[PDB]
């Protein structure tokens, strides 16, 4: 887990294969075992003595033959051209002499071949280790077979012995065979500037301004002197939201199934190369030995990408314009940047081999510099290779961008630079591109709904043939675009799943980044304004400088707001791409209808609530264009159902309800008050006989709950009046005076239920009179208000042991009336004081 | 001193070496987060004290040209970031406050001659969920502990004890006590739950720029408050990051999952229930199974109580008013 994603895990690394030759299987071919999350290595069940038959042997092999292979850095240090005057001190007297001795010394490398390899391969000292008195002890029980099969007995088996261990990598040049036949075709220190590049991850408010830190390194560049251009001669279409790129396209393990890989990105030219040496078909050998040689290859590949984008958008995705091609070019440029910096969040067959070869290139060339593994300075060599690659891309990007523009065409009159989009995390760039696609398709699907389905010439008019022919069919096209899974009407973008599902995955990932990037330890400069803030590093060089990595970007992206993809997207999107209906990404429309048709949350159309009235709440990804909930699917909303979006008087109660509903009933047995969101159990099994009836107890509880809640509610909307005071042509024609006229209706229902309940005590108190059992509304409401006092002004109602407040009584009788059996009015007056606005009347002034 | 008195409130009431300690530590976490929000200006309460404290803190950290956003940022990074320099380690104001909390707990534990709990030993305290969400978790935890308390009371006292209810722990007059406690505690909790759920439904998955108040709730993705609390109350309370648990609440005495939809049709929408915590609506409307066993006699004895207590109220109004009638 310490290793970063680019660190190229298990580096057993032949081109999508190895010493146990395989095809594309998984990211053992060729990186990131920590995310692979299984153990892909068996060098460990390699027994510890076979891992000393590796540690003595293969560890020798790699690191110490590397001491004479690659830590024998090269023989390029002759230093012949230039004469030297002063040196200050001489330390390399033994360096080169013991470097040539370092393969000719009888006392360090012949006393590392026929003395130390007497412990490795030519074992003269511990000859083919036989028995140890001052030598290795083995635990033979699992390593005994090695003695016979390698040391001092028969040694003939499959590649089960040799071939998988690194065997011949050290100048093995046996030439005992001659081949006369020809199987050949036709023959054939550093500078370090730092900057403050102003990213514009926006066009709108953006509380604070962005400024990322990048490291130019002019010594890593061509030399100078811009534009020059002439050379030539160098179809997917499905966002692959899939993942773990098993071996085909897809997203890294950590972004798997989470953001979707644009077809443009999976089709870009560089990503379709397993080499940079393959950049030109004509040339068939290594080409990159200098910084300018390496740069020219990137120039070629960028130019060819520009050529491809021209061949694709103008005019096959472009309408003779330039904005579309320009946006695609910007995105491809940023993807090139990520792909060479190694921070890309996607994969295919050629990536993870391109990255290997790219590490080798950025290795040799430019490598020298990098070395300050511990560092100490900051002009200084780039600490780790990855930062060196980042600096190489932060410089040298000008040349790539101009190459891209040349590859397209523009270059003077159709270009009129360096867009800063390459400084935005690839996740956010993918999110923006995917959303722009969705908004394009949505705009297409909404144009015709707006033209047709506005009631007759506006969304609100006579319903007379709302569907002038079938405008509901246009609304249904829009529904099948939003809800279906790509085959029954769904568009390009999502891959087999509804937009709601894909958006949910995007939100999960975005918030994952937000939480991680500031519950972090190391990040960039803040301007504290947000939630999940505890990490050690929030760094900078100058004032207000973010550290340019993903967490720092999500630190500056948070902390100005933008904690959710909705808000970030409303900030960055152009203006009006979402469609003719002015649907903002920040508003949340909770739509609810027949379960998403093709891929199903546990049903289609009959199992649950979501089956037929599907509750899901995205931004205006909604199944109607943000205002045509009623314009589609005809006649305009009634005054009553304009409460359900005005939403100051919500839906909890039904039959006896501040809350706009009912269930009946109209008989003796048994009209009842129902709560919305819970179902009364009409089972009379709850009860017993000859007492309060089975339905009577559930009624009494529902009624007393109604009483208390609706009294609280009417006080909230009357004294507070939801604002004071008091409280269309106002808010008090619709949504008010609309439930007041409901309360009367359903206090009447509740008055009917309770006078008829005392009449079910003509069914129950004729059994139990006169306790009257249950007491009438007057007396019960009296008791209810008195309990309301005794409970929360008298330290728990059970303090009713002593009732006297001794001067509260005047207030209490004023609020609650005297002489109980008079408590009908304690509620009726609150309805006769459900007035003074409706009343209304006049009003006074 | 707040931590000291808070520990004194929780721990000596029940000597469970973990349960009391873990509950006290969760309460102290909540109090510390509330203190942090008072400093940062995010607090939802402007009472007689915090209103003036908030205004004058705006004065202290403000200036002539500083707007509200700048002032809030100044308070936030004065608290969170190490705006204090000391001869000791790089302690930030948050760390100093938490260390003070720990010292108060140590004082209380020393006085009781107990052992300093392992929780409260954590040096770094995680992020604070938004104040409303923290209060929602507190409400749920308190509701569930008091629900188990009151329902076990009514179970073993009013509705038939293990000893033939007619000859049970009730003479039909103290069973009234248990049912009274349950019904009276339940009633306000229903209104409170309705209010909190209605606020959650308009607050979840909102950034700073979208939420009605300036604070962000991006971290809370859950369609309904019940689903959120299902994710949250899923575990057993420990002291860190899980300050609530809900066992056997609502209707049945098992945990997640008693009946999964994995075997019929994916998925199971809880998630995860801790009792089909949709039962929160049923339990607050007294439609759960557990109460339905007790519904009958609870209601009838409630009516008897209403009748007699009303025969008392009618003669007490006339008692102490003494102007209208008898007594």
């Amino acid at each position: 887990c310490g290793a970063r994603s680019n660190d190229l895990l298990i580096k057993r690394g032949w081109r999508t294969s190895g010493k146990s030759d395989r095809k594309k299987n998984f990211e053992l071919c060729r990186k990131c075992g920590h995310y692979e999350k299984e153990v892909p290595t068996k060098l460990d069940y390699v027994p510890q003595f076979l891992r000393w038959l590796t540690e003595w042997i293969e560890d020798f092999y790699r690191e110490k033959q590397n001491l004479i292979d690659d830590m024998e850095r090269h023989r390029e240090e002759c230093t012949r051209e230039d004469h030297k005057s002063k040196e200050g001190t001489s330390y390399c007297s033994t360096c080169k002499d013991k470097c040539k001795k370092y393969c000719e010394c009888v006392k360090k490398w012949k006393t590392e071949w026929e003395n130390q390899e007497n412990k490795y391969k030519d074992l003269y000292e511990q000859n083919k280790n036989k028995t140890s008195q001052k030598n290795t002890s083995r635990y033979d029980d699992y390593v005994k077979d090695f003695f016979e099969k390698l040391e001092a007995n028969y040694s003939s088996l499959e590649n089960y012995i040799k071939g998988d261990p690194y065997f011949a990598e050290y100048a093995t040049k046996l030439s005992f065979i001659l081949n006369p036949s020809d199987a050949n075709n036709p023959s054939g220190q550093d500078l370090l500037g730092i900057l403050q590049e102003n990213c514009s991850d926006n066009k709108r408010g953006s509380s604070s301004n962005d400024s990322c830190d990048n490291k130019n390194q002019d010594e890593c560049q061509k030399k100078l002197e811009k534009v020059f251009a002439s050379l030539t001669n160098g179809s997917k279409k499905k966002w692959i939201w899939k993942k773990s790129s098993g071996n085909e396209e897809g997203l890294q393990e950590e972004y798997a199934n989470t953001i979707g890989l644009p077809p443009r990105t999976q089709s870009l030219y560089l990503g379709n190369l397993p080499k940079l040496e393959n950049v030109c078909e004509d040339v068939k050998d290594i080409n990159f030995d200098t910084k300018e040689k390496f740069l020219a290859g990137c120039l070629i590949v960028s130019f060819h990408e520009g050529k491809n984008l021209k061949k694709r958008y103008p005019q096959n995705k472009n309408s003779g314009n330039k904005e579309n091609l320009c946006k695609a070019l910007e995105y491809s440029f940023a993807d090139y940047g990520d792909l060479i910096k190694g921070t890309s969040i996607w994969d295919n067959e050629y990536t993870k081999d391109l990255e290997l070869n790219l590490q080798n290139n950025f290795g040799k060339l430019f490598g020298k510099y990098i070395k300050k593994n511990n560092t100490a300075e900051q002009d200084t060599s780039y600490s780790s290779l990855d930062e060196l690659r980042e600096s190489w891309w932060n410089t040298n990007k000008k040349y790539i961008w101009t190459a891209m523009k040349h590859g397209a065409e523009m270059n003077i009159t159709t270009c009129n630079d360096i867009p800063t989009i390459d400084l935005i995390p690839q996740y956010l760039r993918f999110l923006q591109e995917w959303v722009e696609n969705f908004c394009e398709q949505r705009q297409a699907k909404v144009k015709d709904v707006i033209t047709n389905c506005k009631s007759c010439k506006e969304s609100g008019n006579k319903c007379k043939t709302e569907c002038k022919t079938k405008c509901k069919d246009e609304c249904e096209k829009y529904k099948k675009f939003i809800e279906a899974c790509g085959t029954a009407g769904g568009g390009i973008g999502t891959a087999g799943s509804p937009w709601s599902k894909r958006w949910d995955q995007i939100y999960k990932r975005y918030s994952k980044h937000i939480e991680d990037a500031k519950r972090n330890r190391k990040a960039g400069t803040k301007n504290c304004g947000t939630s999940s803030t505890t990490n050690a590093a929030a760094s900078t060089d100058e004032n207000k400088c973010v550290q340019s990595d993903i967490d720092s970007f999500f630190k500056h992206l948070i902390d100005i707001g933008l904690t959710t993809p909705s808000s970030y997207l409303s900030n960055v999107l152009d203006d009006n791409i979402c469609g003719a209906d002015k649907a903002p990404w920040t508003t949340y429309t909770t739509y609810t209808t027949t379960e998403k048709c093709n891929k199903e949350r546990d049903k289609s159309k009959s199992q649950s609530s979501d089956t037929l009235v599907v509750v899901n709440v995205p931004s205006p990804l909604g199944n109607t264009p943000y205002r045509y909930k009623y314009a589609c699917q005809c006649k305009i909303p009634t005054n009553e159902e304009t409460c359900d979006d005005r939403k100051e008087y919500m839906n909890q109660w039904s039959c006896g309800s501040a809350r706009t509903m009912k269930r009946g009933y109209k008989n003796d047995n048994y009209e009842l008050c129902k709560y919305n969101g819970v179902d009364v159990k009409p089972t009379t099994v709850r009860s017993n006989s000859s007492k309060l009836d089975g339905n009577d107890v559930t009624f009494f509880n529902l009624f007393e709950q109604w009483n208390k809640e609706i009294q609280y509610q009417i006080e909230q909307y009357m004294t507070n009046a939801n604002i004071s005071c008091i409280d269309n042509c106002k808010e008090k024609c619709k949504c008010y005076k609309l439930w007041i006229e409901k309360i009367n209706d359903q206090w009447g229902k509740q008055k009917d239920n309770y006078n008829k309940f005392r009449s079910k005590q003509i069914y129950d108190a004729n059994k139990g009179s006169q306790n009257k059992k249950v007491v009438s509304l007057s007396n019960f409401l009296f008791f209810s208000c008195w309990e309301e006092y005794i409970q929360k002004y008298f330290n728990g109602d059970w303090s009713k042991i002593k009732n006297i407040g001794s001067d509260t009584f005047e207030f209490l009788i004023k609020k609650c009336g005297n002489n109980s059996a008079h408590g009908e009015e304690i509620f009726s007056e609150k309805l006769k004081n459900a007035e003074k606005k409706c009343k209304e009347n006049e009003s006074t002034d | 001193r707040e931590a000291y008195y808070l520990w004194k409130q929780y721990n000596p009431t029940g000597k469970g070496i973990d349960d009391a300690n873990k509950k006290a530590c969760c309460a102290i976490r909540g109090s510390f987060y509330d203190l942090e929000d008072i400093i940062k200006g995010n607090d939802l309460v402007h009472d007689e004290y915090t209103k003036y404290i908030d205004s004058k803190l705006n004065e202290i950290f403000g200036s002539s040209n500083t707007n509200d956003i700048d002032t809030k940022r100044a308070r936030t990074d004065w608290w969170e970031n190490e705006t204090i320099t000391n001869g000791t380690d790089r302690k930030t104001i948050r760390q100093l406050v938490w260390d003070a909390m720990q010292s108060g707990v140590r004082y209380a534990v020393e006085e009781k001659n107990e052992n300093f709990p392992l929780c409260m030993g954590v040096e770094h305290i995680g992020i604070a969920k938004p104040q409303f969400i923290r209060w929602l978790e507190e409400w749920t935890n308190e509701f569930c502990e008091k629900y188990t308390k009151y329902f076990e009371d009514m179970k073993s006292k009013c509705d038939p004890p293990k000893r033939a209810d007619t000859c049970g722990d009730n003479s039909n007059i103290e069973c009234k006590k248990a049912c009274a406690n349950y019904t009276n505690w339940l009633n306000p909790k229903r209104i409170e739950w309705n209010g909190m759920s209605n606020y959650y439904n308009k607050i979840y998955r909102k950034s700073n720029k979208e939420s009605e108040d300036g604070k962000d709730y991006s971290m809370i993705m859950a369609p309904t408050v019940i689903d959120y609390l299902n994710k949250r109350c899923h575990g057993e309370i420990n002291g860190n990051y899980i300050c609530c648990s809900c066992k056997n609440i609502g209707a049945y005495n098992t945990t997640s999952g008693t009946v999964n939809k994995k075997l019929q049709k994916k998925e199971t929408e809880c998630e995860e229930e801790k009792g089909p915590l949709d039962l929160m609506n049923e339990v607050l409307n007294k439609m759960d199974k557990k109460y339905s066993a007790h519904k009958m006699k609870c209601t009838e004895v409630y009516l008897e109580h209403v009748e007699e207590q009303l025969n008392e109220i009618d003669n007490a109004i006339k008692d102490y008013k003494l102007y209208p009638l008898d007594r």
Partner: antibody
Amino acid sequence: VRLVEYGGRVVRPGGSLRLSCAAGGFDFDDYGMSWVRQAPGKGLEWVAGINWNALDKKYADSVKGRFTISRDNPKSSVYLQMTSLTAEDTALYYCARDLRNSIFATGALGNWGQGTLVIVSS
Amino acid sequence: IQMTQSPSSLSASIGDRVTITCRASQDIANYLAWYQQKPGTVPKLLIYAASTLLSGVPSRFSGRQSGTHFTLTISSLQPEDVATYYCQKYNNAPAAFGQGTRLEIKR
């Protein structure tokens, strides 16, 4: 759909004045508002803008510090408090709404009020 | 942020094509709206998003954009189109209006 302003008055130079703007069938709770002034026989000039939740208030560079904008959603009003008025602030002041509900102070002003004269002189 | 609108007194006759330019100093990519004001009335928003014609506006208006050059085009000038046009940008901070172009009948 219906915006009316109040407070148009003749004020002494350097004085103060509070303009108000109502709202009609318009759902004045998630739409940004703006104040735009037009001096007599001149071009319009943006003056102030306030977000939907009043967490984002922006001002023109000239009228900054001297002008304050505020909402009151339950009363469905938006107010502009003006102080240190100069002789140059004499203008017809309109209150306008975004035509798009959003999270920003500034936007396309779709519906405008009749405006109030704020003649400033001695 | 300034919004240089020119010409300031464009003249034309009924039936002509009228073009108004609203150069923006910074990048506002398409957060620009066009306003028409007849004498003695409130302004009326014609175009927003720099191209999207507002509903009810006669279709003879159009708006297009090239970089930071925004142009409002009246294809067939009508006697009820004689007014001032303002091209207010609304991207972020000062949302400032244009200078104002006043059309007049050419005789």
